[PDB]
Amino acid sequence: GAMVMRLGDAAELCYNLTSSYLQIAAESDSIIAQTQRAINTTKSILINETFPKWSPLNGEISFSYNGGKDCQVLLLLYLSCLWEYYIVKLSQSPLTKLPTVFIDHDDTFKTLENFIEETSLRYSLSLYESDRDKCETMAEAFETFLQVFPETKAIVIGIRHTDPFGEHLKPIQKTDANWPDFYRLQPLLHWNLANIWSFLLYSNEPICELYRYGFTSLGNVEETLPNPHLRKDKNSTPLKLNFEWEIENRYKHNEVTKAEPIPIADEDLVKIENLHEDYYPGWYLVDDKLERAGRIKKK
Ligand SMILES: Cc1cc2nc3c(=O)[nH]c(=O)nc-3n(C[C@H](O)[C@H](O)[C@H](O)COP(=O)(O)OP(=O)(O)OC[C@H]3O[C@@H](n4cnc5c(N)ncnc54)[C@H](O)[C@@H]3O)c2cc1C
Ligand SMILES: [Mg+2]
Ligand SMILES: [Mg+2]
Ligand SMILES: [Mg+2]
The CATH number assigned to the domain holding 268 equals 3.40.50.620
Contact 281, 214 (CB under 8 A): yes
Resolution (A): 1.4
For ligand 1, whether the C-beta of 158 sits within 6 Å is: yes
CA of 129 from ligand 3 middle (Å) equals 6
CA of 84 from ligand 2 middle (Å) equals 25
Contact 49, 172 (CB under 8 A): yes
Nearest residue to 217 (alpha-carbon basis) of 270, 271, 287, 125: 287
For ligand 1, whether the C-beta of 130 sits within 6 Å is: no
Ligand 1 atom showing the smallest separation from residue 169 Cα: 17
Please compute, for residue 106, the number of CA atoms within 13 A of its CA located in the half-sphere on the CB side. 5
For ligand 1, whether the C-beta of 102 sits within 6 Å is: yes
What torsion, rounded to 10 degrees, do the Cα atoms 96, 92, 173, 180 define? 50
Distance CA 98, CA 129 (A): 14
Domain tally, the chain: 1
For ligand 1, whether the C-beta of 167 sits within 6 Å is: no
Spatial strand order of the sheet with 154-156 comes to 125-129, 98-102, 61-64, 154-156, 183-185, 172-174
Give me the domain span that covers residue 228.
Answer: 1-299
Ligand 1 atom showing the smallest separation from residue 142 Cα: 1
| Nearest CA owner, ligand 1 atom 51 | 157
Single-letter code of the amino acid located at 207: I
DSSP-derived 3-state class of residue 145: helix
| Nearest CA owner, ligand 1 atom 1 | 155
What single-letter DSSP state applies at residue 264? Answer: P
Nearest residue to 114 (alpha-carbon basis) of 224, 10, 261: 261
For ligand 1, whether the C-beta of 103 sits within 6 Å is: yes
What single-letter DSSP state applies at residue 63? Answer: E
Nearest residue to 65 (alpha-carbon basis) of 11, 130, 140: 130
Using what technique was this structure determined?
Answer: X-ray
Nearest residue to 100 (alpha-carbon basis) of 83, 75, 76, 73: 75
CA of 277 from ligand 1 middle (Å) equals 31
Distance CA 169, CA 163 (A): 10
Query: 264-281 b/e with 16+ CB inside 10 Å = b?
Result: bbeebbeebeeeeeebbb
For ligand 1, whether the C-beta of 125 sits within 6 Å is: no
Burial class (CB in 10 A: 0-12, 13-18, 19+), 251: middle
Contact 47, 85 (CB under 8 A): yes
Beta strands in 21-97 (DSSP E): 61-64
